[PDB]
Design a binder for this molecule. Structure first.
Ligand SMILES: Nc1ncnc2c1ncn2[C@@H]1O[C@H](COP(=O)(O)OP(=O)(O)O)[C@@H](O)[C@H]1O
Ligand SMILES: Nc1ncnc2c1ncn2[C@@H]1O[C@H](COP(=O)(O)OP(=O)(O)O)[C@@H](O)[C@H]1O
Ligand SMILES: Nc1ncnc2c1ncn2[C@@H]1O[C@H](COP(=O)(O)OP(=O)(O)O)[C@@H](O)[C@H]1O
Lengths: 55, 371, 371, 371
């Protein structure tokens, strides 16, 4: 019984670690998406001010 | 009757039937041979394993690729690969099936000629045909206009097409691809003490690359953030243990596509050869080409490559033009999708190279109007 | 016809027929000669006793082993051993039976060549073959991969095999075995007053070792347990009477296998040469090797040696792999069992060295692909 | 002030002053510790012998090499090596001497980082610098182009240099060297009857190798010559008498450099990695590289290695090239000679890494333009 529960706890650890590291990858790609969003934002706000001043 | 669609490529054979949504047989194009002694009598072991079987016995075999950069350099190995694909992965008799094969632009002529000679004499198909990979990518993409960047495993190329007319003088071909990215990643992993020298460890490194590498949006800022923080470090577990920790070489590897000087090449990045193919085209179609920039092939599968290439091409092109990069999720199989579509088209049934045409005209029939 | 399987070993001869489940003749590999004068006329006594008879006449003879560490040092004695085995224990005519002999890895070549020359010239067998002990052990174990640790009485060796291919650069051989354990026990038994010096008291000490020694799962804790308690102290009754009591040297004797510095050797324990053989193999067969660690030979018969080996190799290898040690109850005879299997294989009947091949190519024909 | 050129190597430390014609101190990079108990009270044994003394007390020590394949694995042992070099062999105070250190291509970065951290903090040198061994070989050879093959004792590498510019993408490194040749010679002598197992017998085997081994011009013909004649056998005198006679083992050991499958490596010989580095280089400089093939390091010192490598590279290259192999008699010390030249150059005096720069920027300063 001790060995059985050892192995089951191990496989559960494996599953949890899979989920957690996939979430880490997702949050990293999301924060990169967010900085790219922000830089596109600054560029488009600047061209917005240009267009509005020239208009 | 049905046609087979075998997309060879340089490092992943994928085949199937014309009229399906996907290939039913995808395996590496490797041929392994045992390099050790062999002691157990009665084991009855073979002399060469091909395909996915050779991947389970990497620790015993020496792995060869029969296709270096598009070009086939080992015809015996390639004949073995084709035999395996026909009889063991697909289980079809190739004497009753037309076969559609693919190749990259600007290859030698003897490659294509010897390919058809094999397919008619050895495997004895009733008909066959060789297609350009970029055209099939464009079929599968649902377009008839666009510049397609097909980064495979041995060769990268751009092929601009407009309204179904291909502009051959603007085709670019570059010999930087996934195999060179794997070699560069092996070379820069040694900075942390990991060493992979065996042909069987090249596969471990390829899996590392596929699972962990990505394209940085800004290379200098990513280098700075990797130097400062430690939030980029990611671990990988080898077939044994000693989990390896990978830092900035997560994104220094695929950056070789945008800075080929990393591996000592003189040429320019993929963004710049794409832009150069554009500016090589006419002037009346450059807007459509900017708006229909199609990616395909396995080396275009890194996270962030679409955004990076859009940033670069947008910085290059004029400001009044809207750049767009089409990157489907099934990019790796686009050539096969397009090949299946094309071979199922009823108009195409007059374009095959029949066996009698070959018998009467020699293998030269392949560069002829029977393309 | 039937083949004989003679597992010479070093300190125990095991012979039989190919196709049986066990050897039918197991006797010590000793040759004794009388050392006293001999007074009774008409006794008609012999000049040299071989095998199990010498162990009866121990008190009168000097017992010599003709095999030191795998290597044969006395060819006349070894020829007597073989003659006894063929004619008195098995009762067969060796000119009608092929003979399969066994040998340890990394022995001199003249050993094997002279063995072949004897078997063809003196005993006149029709065919013969020399096999490696570890391979035959793996046959008998039912595996086809796995790293085998064959600790006999002369030598200890690891031989990693994967899919029937042996990796010769990773073969390890150590000259620590049961004979050295017997000598160490003779030496440390003098701390309690018992003195065994004669060549025939070594057999008594070997019996003590076999019947009372065991491997401690933890050496310092057993040292302290013996220093405090007396629950691990056991007794033994000599052929003379006068029982002897064995204390903590019940487990200090086989601990020499894990700490060869006890007998002044430089090398590392069996648990560490096994791991070094693993780490000298490839990277993508190490998981299978960790999971298929096979023990054979008489010196692996101690109680607790499998559990100790597992604890040690587990503390050595990475924490994410299942380390498993295969230790059958019929370990001591594994080499012979595998030899019988091999010689009965119908595929093997073409691997014999026939007599005509020898007559035409000399004894050098032994090192050919029949190696 | 004058600089110190310490080519720490891997298996031989070579030190001296910049501006000399040869190293002043040459001794093995070995740290020995006593492994027996020690009974004579009052003689005051020490706990670790380092250098040439450990070879005198070799019989009662365990010899460790602090550096395995270029890489340092024992930093405490390496600090002892350096301390011995500075104080007990050169008799200088490193607080007043710049120190040039040498390293192989493609090592971990922590190697250089810890090396400079130690040199600045433990030894307090005023400046230091880490150079590549192949560049220094090419200095000492009086060339400015050429492909240099530097075979030391842990690592072999090719570094193609043209006109003072190095081609980093063509640098090849191989982990087969003199230490693996010694291990193969041990393992291959065991088949003639001699066994050397201890770390103190490894040194005797290394001496046998240096003194009797050579490279065959034609391996198969020399094998047949040894199998038929007996004119190849030399005798060697062990440090206790009992001469040993070796036959084809003389040319079978260094043949591992040209067939690394002998020791179970998959890679290609040195003659083939040299040619592959050349073929990676640009097409316009391959003629000069073919003409300037420079050998250095102790493992390039066998008799016949230059002729063998010329035969091989000539059979590989096109038949219209002049293959030429430069093998000076002072090959073994080429790295040190070039290091002395470099450190004495007057242009070099602003390329040291000063103590101020280090205290400013941390050990990361090593990989900067001050390489
Ligand atoms: N998810 C991924 N990320 C990065 N590279 C990948 C990924 N998947 C595959 N690759 C690379 O793509 C290459 C295979 O591309 P593929 O489409 O098979 O070309 P080909 O069929 O011409 O060999 C492999 O070398 C692999 O390294
Ligand atoms: N139960 C046991 N416990 C410990 N040692 C044993 C046991 N049985 C046999 N041995 C040892 O094994 C040795 C014989 O091993 P064996 O397998 O016969 O090798 P070989 O056939 O080469 O002599 C003897 O020296 C004996 O001391
Ligand atoms: N005459 C020789 N023939 C063959 N090998 C030699 C000879 N002299 C030295 N060696 C080998 O060279 C190695 C030392 O090479 P060396 O130039 O000292 O490299 P490092 O300085 O990095 O140790 C030793 O292992 C030795 O076996």
């Amino acid at each position: 019984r001790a060995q059985e529960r050892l192995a089951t706890a191990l496989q559960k650890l494996e599953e949890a670690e899979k989920a957690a590291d996939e979430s880490e990858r997702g949050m990293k790609v999301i924060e990169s998406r967010a900085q790219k969003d922000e830089e596109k934002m600054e560029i488009q706000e600047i061209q917005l001010k240009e267009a509005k001043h020239i208009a | 009757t049905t046609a087979l669609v075998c997309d060879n490529g340089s490092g992943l054979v994928k085949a199937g039937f014309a009229g399906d949504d996907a290939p039913r047989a995808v395996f590496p194009s490797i041929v392994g041979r045992p390099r050790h002694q062999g002691v157990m009598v009665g084991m009855g072991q073979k002399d060469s394993y091909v395909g996915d079987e050779a991947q389970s016995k990497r620790g015993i075999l020496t792995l060869k690729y029969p296709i270096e950069h598009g070009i086939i350099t080992n015809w015996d190995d390639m004949e073995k690969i084709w035999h395996h694909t026909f009889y063991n992965e697909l289980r079809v008799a190739p004497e009753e099936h037309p076969t559609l094969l693919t190749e990259a632009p600007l290859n030698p002529k003897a490659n294509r000629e010897k390919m058809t000679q094999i397919m008619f004499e050895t495997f004895n198909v009733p008909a066959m045909y060789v297609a350009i990979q970029a055209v099939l990518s464009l079929y599968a993409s649902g377009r008839t206009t666009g510049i397609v960047l097909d980064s495979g495993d041995g060769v990268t190329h751009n092929v601009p097409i407009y309204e179904g007319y291909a502009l051959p003088h603007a085709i670019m071909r570059l010999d930087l691809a996934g195999r060179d990215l794997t070699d560069y990643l092996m070379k820069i992993l040694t900075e942390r003490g990991y060493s992979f020298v065996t042909t069987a460890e090249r596969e471990i490194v390829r899996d590392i690359k596929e699972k962990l590498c990505y394209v940085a949006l800004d290379f200098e800022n990513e280098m700075a953030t990797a130097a400062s923080s430690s939030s980029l470090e990611k671990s990988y577990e080898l077939p044994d243990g000693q989990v390896i920790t990978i830092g900035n070489e997560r994104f220094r590897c695929p950056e070789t596509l945008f800075q080929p000087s990393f591996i000592g090449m003189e040429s320019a990045g993929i963004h710049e050869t794409t832009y150069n193919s554009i500016m090589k085209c006419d002037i009346d179609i450059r807007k459509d080409l900017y708006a229909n920039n199609v990616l395909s092939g396995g080396t275009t599968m890194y996270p962030g490559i679409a955004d990076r290439m859009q940033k670069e091409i947008t910085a290059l092109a004029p400001s009044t033009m809207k750049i767009k990069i089409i990157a489907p999720p099934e990019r790796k199989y686009s050539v096969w999708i397009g090949g299946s579509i094309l071979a199922s088209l009823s108009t195409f049934q007059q374009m095959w190279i029949s066996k009698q045409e070959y018998d009467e005209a020699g293998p030269s029939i392949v560069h002829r109007k029977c393309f």
